[PDB]
Design a protein around this ligand. Sequence first.
Ligand SMILES: CC(C)=CCC/C(C)=C/CC/C(C)=C/COP(=O)(O)O
Ligand SMILES: [Mg+2]
Ligand SMILES: [Mg+2]
Ligand SMILES: [Mg+2]
Length: 536
Amino acid sequence: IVRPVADFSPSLWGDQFLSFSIKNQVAEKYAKEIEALKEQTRNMLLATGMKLADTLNLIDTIERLGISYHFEKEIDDILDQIYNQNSNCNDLCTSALQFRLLRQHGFNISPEIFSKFQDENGKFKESLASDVLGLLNLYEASHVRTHADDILEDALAFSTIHLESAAPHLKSPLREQVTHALEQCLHKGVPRVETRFFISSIYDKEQSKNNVLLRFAKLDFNLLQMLHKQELAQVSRWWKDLDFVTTLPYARDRVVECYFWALGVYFEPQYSQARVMLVKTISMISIVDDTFDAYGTVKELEAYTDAIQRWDINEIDRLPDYMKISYKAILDLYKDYEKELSSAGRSHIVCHAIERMKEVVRNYNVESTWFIEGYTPPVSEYLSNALATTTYYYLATTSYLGMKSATEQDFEWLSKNPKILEASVIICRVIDDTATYEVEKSRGQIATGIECCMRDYGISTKEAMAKFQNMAETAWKDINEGLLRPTPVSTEFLTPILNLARIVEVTYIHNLDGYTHPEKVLKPHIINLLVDSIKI
Ligand SMILES: CC(C)=CCC/C(C)=C/CC/C(C)=C/COP(=O)(O)O
Ligand SMILES: [Mg+2]
Ligand SMILES: [Mg+2]
Ligand SMILES: [Mg+2]
């Protein structure tokens, strides 16, 4: 058996994350100050007699500064009041902000709030083209539409062209904020990534900045960063003691990138256990993926697939030595999860993730069979298999394991492939297929998504990519609609799914692959989130 040649770049991080010793004095000092700043900020939110515009700008600022997770109740009460008073008498910037904040929080505010800014034709009044703050908030708002918001169909094009036109002559930091928004809208960005940018590049440089909020935002970001570094060290240790880097040398060494992904799903301190569980699963399914993609023979992958379905340590002997390694590691990981969830009486939920992993592996094997046969399925058949191979049903399920408040009913809802989950999975599938089409085509993978699309509909590569882009836009509208009240489960269990879609958009930004090639996209984010603190 002549295996393929090892082609993955080594981890670019070395051991720089392996050992992090927290300074308790600094941590305790930060925590104590934050407690005081947190109360000052609460009183700012609860101030009586504030105008609508000032209230919305305060909430927006606290959200972008990344400290809104301290004020979920206060912010919810205030937006709920604004939603129910149905105030509809403002300029474009307050109106667009009002619409975006309410929708992001699941309040189904009517899009008719935008009619007064449009002509008879439903097109935005071009006279608004010189109101840069209106255009900027309209722009951000355009990304939260559902299928019921066709009144906003023109908003992205309109605001984009006039923001591009205005940008070079804007003062700083507004210019940098506009320029940044045109590359990465807020609603589809990774929250920590956008927070780090806003704090350091924008709010820190605003003439009108509130000093209490800025100091609060920097201390809190740097304090949470200490936690993230501890987690990453603990996970780096775990990965090192498995030593796949030498026993399974065909496989990508990407535990830092995997941690960044888990950090994108949730950054808050109460999700520490959930993050560590999640990153271990992303790491491990990545190994399995490389086993199917870049090492195993058809015969070996069959045995591996069947062994996974039966899920029993008895089965290791049917496997080649090198597969014994990952298989025992997989089984042990899930035994660890059960043990770690035992004191909370939540061990029994691990089976939900196990069943999703089995599904991923079944579909991995189908994908291998297709490649070997030179099969090009129709799109419907392609999708029936390739949606699960995104791993996104599996990761979403995994993200619930460490969430203390996730119940059996939450897992039951997720097992039915709800619409919002399906949309998130679709976004991952079509964006990766658009970005990795050329490579996969070079490797002979004739069952890749865009190829299936071209052959099925009889259209060009360009037209197929346009069709996949439409699928992503439709899926984003479904995600946005999936967040609207009443939600089928607590919003706490929707946000991970939204954040999985965001991570996709951020990792494949401008359409190149970012996990297998972390040098382009992910490296700067990892440095800004997990290496450099924000200077105070
Ligand atoms: C499979 C891996 C590396 C999972 C861990 C990181 C992750 C969640 C990536 C996004 C999911 C996709 C689209 C993976 C594409 O794998 P293929 O090139 O088709 O074998
Ligand atoms: Mg792969
Ligand atoms: Mg694969
Ligand atoms: Mg791909």
